[PDB]
Amino acid sequence: ENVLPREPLIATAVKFLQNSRVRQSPLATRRAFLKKKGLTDEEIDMAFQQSGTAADE
């Protein structure tokens, strides 16, 4: 499944998101992206909650 909820994923995700362009990248990408990378639904809002996007969750 690969989608095993892991904190290392969150850390890598937050880095990814707030690196530069990902914050400006549409969530249409970001949603499928994190979920396919291995983050469950819970984890994807976790990463976005920590990074603080607060837009189209």
């Binding site: 890598t12 995700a13 690196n19 362009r21 992206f33 990378k37």
Partner: peptide
Amino acid sequence: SQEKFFQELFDS
């Protein structure tokens, strides 16, 4: 490449 940006950056 933006595609690689999703890959390389999230790889590590």
